[PDB]
Amino acid sequence: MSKGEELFTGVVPILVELDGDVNGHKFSVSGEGEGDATYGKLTLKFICTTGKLPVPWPTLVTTFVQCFARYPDHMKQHDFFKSAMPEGYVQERTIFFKDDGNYKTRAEVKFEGDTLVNRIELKGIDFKEDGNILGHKLEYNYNSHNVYIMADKQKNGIKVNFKIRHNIEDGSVQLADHYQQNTPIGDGPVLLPDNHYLSTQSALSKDPNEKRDHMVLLEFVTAAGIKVCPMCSEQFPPDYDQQVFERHVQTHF
């Protein structure tokens, strides 16, 4: 459905660079790994190159290449992200931490040679030095979420929203409301989609031989949101021939 699409048919190398400033605490993070959009799979490891991260690693999970989403055959028309490639897209976000500060981010994602590269600037303000973020009170894990996408034809792109729950130690949760826009860098045609979502799931781990402050991130990302026997609830592929299916339903009578 786009020239972009064809660029993701194999494993693609990824590089990430973030510059951050949260409540004046400056830091930088570099990441590398690879992505496999046929599977919907990101494999990344990030390292804080300025020392220790002044925020919990899990608050940067969302910031740390949605072009690696698996879009099934029947929805490839709705894949804005690859359709912008190679010239790429800019991702903007504001992220509001309930009862705390906010991050604003701007990312440039595009191919640099054969590598997909995300260069990000992040600013955080109004955080509580004793709150869950600057206080490092967040657990080192993550939950599944759905990323809701819609077209923003006015800006030739998409608008995206979702809410993240970050588990806290005492068993509380810290809410992070994400408001996102993506616009193409280049001026070729892009794919503008019907409303749908990315099911995303995230596993965070540690490289037992890495002494630097670091996060290993696995992500699995599959698009959805664009078949069941009414008698016995048996499940069939959504492509499953309609008359074969009804023949199964008739079996109940």
Check binding of 241 to Zn ion (CB under 5 A): no
Q: Letter for the amino acid at 113?
A: G
Please count the CA atoms within 13 angstroms of the CA of 134 that sit on its side-chain side: 19
- CB atoms < 10 A from the CB of 119, how many? 15
Check binding of 232 to Zn ion (CB under 5 A): yes
- Figure out which of the listed residues 125, 175, 203, 231 binds Zn ion, where binding follows CB under 5 A: 231
**Helix, strand, coil percent content, the chain, rounded in steps of 5:** 15, 45, 40
CB of 113 to a copy of itself, least distance (A): 27
252 annotated binding-site participant: yes
The CA–CA distances, whole Å, from 46 to 30, 60, 207 equal 6, 10, 10
- Pick 50 or 167: Cβ nearer a copy of itself: 167
- Pick 81 or 127: Cβ nearer Zn ion: 127
Which DSSP letter does residue 38 get?
Answer: T
Residue with tokens 């600013």: 123
The CA–CA distances, whole Å, from 236 to 231, 233, 240 equal 13, 10, 6
Considering CB distances under 5 to 8 angstroms, the limit depending on partner class, which of Zn ion, a copy of itself, none binds residue 156?
none
CB of 98 to Zn ion, least distance (A): 26
Which residue ranges make up the site for a copy of itself (CB under 8 A)? 38-41, 52, 70, 129-130, 134-136, 139-144, 167, 199, 201-208, 218-220, 222, 228, 232-235
Which DSSP letter does residue 41 get?
Answer: E
- Pick 48 or 109: Cβ nearer Zn ion: 48
CB of 144 to a copy of itself, least distance (A): 4
- Pick 26 or 136: Cβ nearer a copy of itself: 136
Taking the C-alpha atoms of residue 115 and residue 15, their distance in angstroms, rounded to an integer, is 7
Check binding of 228 to Zn ion (CB under 5 A): no
Considering CB distances under 5 to 8 angstroms, the limit depending on partner class, which of Zn ion, a copy of itself, none binds residue 229?
Zn ion
9 Cβ neighbours under 8 A, 6+ residues apart: 37, 38
Tokens of 121: 């600037």
CB of 35 to a copy of itself, least distance (A): 14
Q: Residues annotated in the binding site for Zn(2+), as ranges?
A: 229, 232, 248, 252
Binding region? 229, 232, 248, 252
